[PDB]
Amino acid sequence: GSHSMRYFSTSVSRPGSGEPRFIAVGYVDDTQFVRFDSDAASQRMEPRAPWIEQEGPEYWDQETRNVKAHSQTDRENLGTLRGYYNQSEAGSHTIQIMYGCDVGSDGRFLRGYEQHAYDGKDYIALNEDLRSWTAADMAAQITQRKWEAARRAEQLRAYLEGTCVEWLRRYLENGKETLQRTDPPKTHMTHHPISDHEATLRCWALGFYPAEITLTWQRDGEDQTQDTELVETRPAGDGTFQKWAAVVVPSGEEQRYTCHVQHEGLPKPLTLRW
Amino acid sequence: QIMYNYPAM
Amino acid sequence: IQRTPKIQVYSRHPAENGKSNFLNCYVSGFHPSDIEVDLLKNGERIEKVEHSDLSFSKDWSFYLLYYTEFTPTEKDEYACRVNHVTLSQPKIVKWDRDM
């Protein structure tokens, strides 16, 4: 039962008089728990899970203060990167950041992350060793050298191994009723004749948490991938997730085709047929 | 809890 | 580089005529972030539609969930309409209770 905390932010410039739109969200595993939207009236970090509302005004005052500073730094960085790339003021550009940490079931640090993108492409990221950087191009190596001179990796590593882990532990305890649950998928099969020779089988997984799941088809005992379709795992809207997998088969030969469902909430994988 | 500051690029 | 949205329209629970439910449009894989997403009832935009906070995937593309409470019926047709800079015209995906 390893766990993760991730923070995401997106800053989008708005050419003309306007300031950028900054949106930040935080997640514990697959459960969002905070948001900030610079366009919103509150100008505060806001709760998005019940188990974070118990934090006191001191928690919210600091989160609000720091997320506003983050938005202002990204506003400045949009100008810096525009300069590196010799880009005009006329276009909208986007800076994205993801960061956070993983812990094991004993609540101890496993892995840390900090990745940056510009206009939807890699820009610079912290390496797995939390001591070195990967820059995508020469602009990003200007940034890299600034961060090397500032010893940023050490300072960021202290956050990822320290603060990030300890607060993830706190959230996991305060939300244990829901975050340390596994909801197994409920599975069923549907069947749609196409023609005198073909039929569609669709294998459903509903109501599961966390989102990680594997659906696979087997024909007479070996994995079947030709003539299959797998949709992206999608939110149900109530905290659980959904997925389906389909295969086109000769009509009347559906008994050959077994759907296999793997999920951490299942003692053993489920198999099902029409 | 979020990090204290974002870095200048 | 621009990335065109992927669209899934579906209900929260298996649909039962006359029983309350939620109608979802999940749109993912897109860049840049500005997008228009609506839920349609018999071709008309549904007014009380909420959506999730902007977030993104490992490949940096964005995703959003748009949702509304609804009670499916025999005669009502639902769809999700998406507009984005990558689209020459809005993309309309009809709700199919088995997709």
Please check whether residue A135 touches B, CB under 8 A: no
Of the candidates A216, A205, A212, A215, the one whose C-alpha atom is nearest the C-alpha of residue A182 is A212
Longest dimension (CA), chain C: 45
Q: Experimental method for this entry?
A: X-ray
**Which tokens go with A36?**
């900030």
What CA–CA distance (Å, rounded) separates A182 from A102? 18
**Which tokens go with C42?**
């018999």
Is the same domain home to A259 and A217?
yes
What CA–CA distance (Å, rounded) separates A27 from A102? 12
One-letter identity of residue A86: N
A226: CATH: 2.60.40.10
The domain boundary residue, chosen from A181, A211, A246? A181
Q: Can you say whether residue A142 is alpha, beta or left, with left for phi > 0 and alpha for psi between -120 and 50 degrees?
A: alpha
Taking CB atoms and an 8 Å limit, are B8 and A69 in contact across chains?
no
What CA–CA distance (Å, rounded) separates C70 from A172? 33
What CA–CA distance (Å, rounded) separates A228 from A200? 10
Is the same domain home to A151 and A70?
yes
Q: Are A243 and A215 in contact (CB under 8 A)?
A: yes
CB within 8 A of A50, min separation 6: which ones?
Answer: A175
What CA–CA distance (Å, rounded) separates A56 from A53? 8
Is the same domain home to A10 and A134?
yes
Q: Give, for A246, the enclosing helix (H) or strand (E).
A: strand A241-250
Taking CB atoms and an 8 Å limit, are A234 and C56 in contact across chains?
no
Q: Which residue of A has its CA nearest to B3?
A: A159
Which three-class secondary structure string do you get for C3-51?
Answer: ECCEEEEEECCCCCCCCCEEEEEEEEEEECCCCEEEEEECCEECCCCEE
Is the same domain home to A177 and A189?
no
CB within 8 A of A188, min separation 6: which ones?
Answer: A204, A206, A272
The 10 Å Cβ neighbour count of residue C69 is 13
Is the same domain home to A98 and A204?
no
For A231, which DSSP code? P
Contacts 24+ apart (CB under 8 A), A169-177: A169/A103, A169/A107, A171/A5, A171/A28, A171/A33, A171/A51, A171/A52, A172/A3, A172/A28, A172/A107, A174/A51, A174/A52, A174/A54, A175/A28, A175/A31, A175/A33, A175/A49, A175/A50, A175/A51, A175/A52, A177/A51
Q: Which residue has the tokens 């999940």?
A: C26
What CA–CA distance (Å, rounded) separates A165 from A31? 17
The 10 Å Cβ neighbour count of residue A60 is 17
One-letter identity of residue A218: Q
Is the same domain home to A159 and A193?
no
Chains A and B touch (3+ CB pairs under 8 A): yes
One-letter identity of residue C16: E
Is the same domain home to A249 and A136?
no
Is the same domain home to A186 and A175?
no
Q: Are A117 and A77 in contact (CB under 8 A)?
A: no
Query: Considering its fold, how many domains does chain C have in total?
Result: 1
One-letter identity of residue A261: V
Q: Can you say whether residue A6 is alpha, beta or left, with left for phi > 0 and alpha for psi between -120 and 50 degrees?
A: beta
The domain boundary residue, chosen from A181, A202, A234? A181
Is the same domain home to A194 and A72?
no
What CA–CA distance (Å, rounded) separates C9 from C56? 19
What CA–CA distance (Å, rounded) separates A103 from A129? 16
* Containing structural domain, residue C70: 1-99
* Angle, alpha carbons A191-A192-A196 (nearest 5°): 120
Q: Are A214 and A207 in contact (CB under 8 A)?
A: no
The domain boundary residue, chosen from A132, A164, A181? A181
**Cis amide bond preceding C32, omega within 30:** yes
Q: Are A81 and A139 in contact (CB under 8 A)?
A: yes
Q: Which residue has the tokens 């999700």?
A: C80
- Please, what is the angle between helix A57-84 and helix A138-149, to 10°? 130
Of the candidates A238, A240, A216, the one whose C-alpha atom is nearest the C-alpha of residue A228 is A216
Alpha helices in chain A (DSSP H): 57-84, 138-149, 152-158, 164-174, 176-179
Query: Considering its fold, how many domains does chain A have in total?
Result: 2
B6 contacts in chain A (CB < 8 Å): 69-70, 73-74, 77, 97
CB within 8 A of A222, min separation 6: which ones?
Answer: none
Q: Taking the CA atoms of A103, A104, A105 and A108 in sequence, report the sign of the dihedral they define.
A: negative
Is the same domain home to A83 and A72?
yes
C58: CATH: 2.60.40.10
Q: Which residue of A has its CA nearest to C12?
A: A236
Q: Which residue of A has its CA nearest to C31?
A: A120
Is the same domain home to A1 and A57?
yes
Chains C and B touch (3+ CB pairs under 8 A): no
* Containing structural domain, residue A225: 182-274
